[PDB]
Amino acid sequence: AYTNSFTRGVYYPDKVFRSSVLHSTQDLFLPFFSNVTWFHAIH
Amino acid sequence: QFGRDIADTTDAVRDPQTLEILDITPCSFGGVSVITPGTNTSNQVAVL
Ligand SMILES: *[C@@H]1O[C@H](CO)[C@@H](O)[C@H](O)[C@H]1NC(C)=O
Ligand SMILES: *[C@@H]1O[C@H](CO)[C@@H](O)[C@H](O)[C@H]1NC(C)=O
Ligand SMILES: *[C@@H]1O[C@H](CO)[C@@H](O)[C@H](O)[C@H]1NC(C)=O
């Protein structure tokens, strides 16, 4: 089973504080609206 | 520990002795223009 990841999976590529800017970076990110497997923990 | 500006320069640092954030503001500067009559008349000048 898969669900909609929406906009999850973005993390800070480094340890520099940045603010009020649009930054283009290439790194290992979760594709937006990609399928992520939905797991259960019952029974 | 460090912040950066659009130009990639440092905007602020955390003081390693006291954990506070300090801004760095470049010291006041500006152009200087000289208004002068020709040296064929007088050597007195004014500074703008
Ligand atoms: C997710 O899976 C659905 C059906 O399982 C499919 O229609 C859709 O194209 C998939 N999306 C992605 C981003 O893989
Ligand atoms: C020395 O470093 C310690 C460690 O954080 C700090 O508590 C203290 O303020 C520092 N000493 C001075 C004089 O800043
Ligand atoms: C220089 O000064 C002389 C006399 O003071 C004057 O006759 C001459 O026209 C001047 N030349 C210029 C270029 O100002």
Side-chain angles (χ1 to χ4, degrees), chain B:
Chain B
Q1 181 60 36
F2 300 154
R4 291 181 139 72
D5 211 326
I6 186 169
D8 212 37
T9 63
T10 304
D11 289 337
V13 296
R14 185 169 62 181
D15 186 359
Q17 288 305 349
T18 299
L19 303 180
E20 306 273 308
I21 301 299
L22 308 173
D23 282 341
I24 300 171
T25 299
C27 300
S28 176
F29 66 93
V32 176
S33 293
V34 180
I35 186 165
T36 182
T39 56
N40 181 25
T41 299
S42 178
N43 291 325
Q44 184 175 36
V45 302
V47 179
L48 180 161

Side-chain angles (χ1 to χ4, degrees), chain A residues 15-19 21, chain B residues 1-5 8:
Chain A
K15 298 185 170 71
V16 295
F17 177 82
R18 187 184 321 281
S19 63
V21 64
Chain B
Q1 181 60 36
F2 300 154
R4 291 181 139 72
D5 211 326
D8 212 37

Side-chain angles (χ1 to χ4, degrees), chain A residues 17-36:
Chain A
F17 177 82
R18 187 184 321 281
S19 63
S20 300
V21 64
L22 301 177
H23 178 69
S24 174
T25 183
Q26 182 177 24
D27 208 330
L28 303 174
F29 292 96
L30 183 67
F32 275 10
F33 296 97
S34 67
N35 284 345
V36 299

